[PDB]
Structure 1
């Protein structure tokens, strides 16, 4: 089968966590 370096999962998750915090802040804004 075909494989890629797993370290990339780490990076992606980290960023998505931020992009997630951003959205929550964004919606909490308009809610305020």
Structure 2
């Protein structure tokens, strides 16, 4: 049938971390571009 209601939660958590990971890198890149306009 399906998987644990918490196994779902674990995966959803993992995916979130991946998202937070990529967003952090995007963040940094944006600071670089913004700081270029400032310097």
**TM-score computed with the length of structure 2 as normaliser:** 0.55
Q: CA RMSD of the aligned region, Å? A: 1.3
Question: Which consecutive residues of structure 1, in runs of 5 or more, have no partner in the other structure?
Answer: none
Question: Which consecutive residues of structure 2, in runs of 5 or more, have no partner in the other structure?
Answer: 31-39
Q: Of Structure 1 and Structure 2, which has the larger fraction of its residues in strand?
A: 1
